[PDB]
């Protein structure tokens, strides 16, 4: 599966082309799908690290949770 | 003292997943659980979507993550011994 990154997930902001990929490589497409996605599951890829994993998660988290605001 | 706070996470019937989340915040007593708000939890990523269910599951009690504030943990139940 080419796992290509949706434009929010590759739209989300501290992330690069190359973050996107491997994040999508876990089955992943749309930033939501990233924030279900825990600091462990980050881990699977070493191109993540447990503080760059979850600082993402809780972005992603928070584009949905705060997402009604602009 | 609410004895399911003086309880250690690990001992919440739900699996050690449930209280590895919150435990991984070097958190042993569910009594911690109450110090902090489930905000200022929700605003860490070590939570997961699965274990933000089992903590409702648990919040279902009404025991724990009531939004208590202690000012040190052993309330004047627990008091010197």
Not at chain 1, 18 to 46: M, S
Not at chain 2, 63 to 68: D, Q, R
Not at chain 2, 71 to 77: K, R, T, Y
Request: some cysteine; hydrophobic content about 40%.
């Amino acid at each position: 599966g080419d796992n290509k990154p949706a434009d929010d997930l590759l739209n989300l902001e501290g992330v690069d082309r190359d973050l996107a990929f491997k994040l999508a490589a876990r089955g992943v497409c749309t930033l939501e799908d990233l924030a279900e996605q825990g600091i462990d599951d980050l881990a699977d890829i070493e191109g993540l690290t447990d503080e760059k994993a979850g600082a993402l998660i809780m972005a992603a988290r928070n584009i949905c949770w705060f997402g009604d605001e602009a | 003292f609410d004895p399911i706070l003086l309880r250690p996470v690990d001992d919440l019937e739900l699996t050690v997943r449930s209280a590895n989340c919150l435990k991984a915040e070097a958190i042993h007593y569910i009594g911690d659980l109450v110090q902090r708000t489930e905000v200022e939890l929700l605003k860490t990523p070590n939570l997961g979507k699965k274990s933000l269910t089992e903590i409702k599951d648990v919040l279902a009690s009404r025991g724990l993550s009531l939004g208590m504030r202690l000012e040190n943990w052993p309330p004047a139940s627990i008091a010197d011994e």
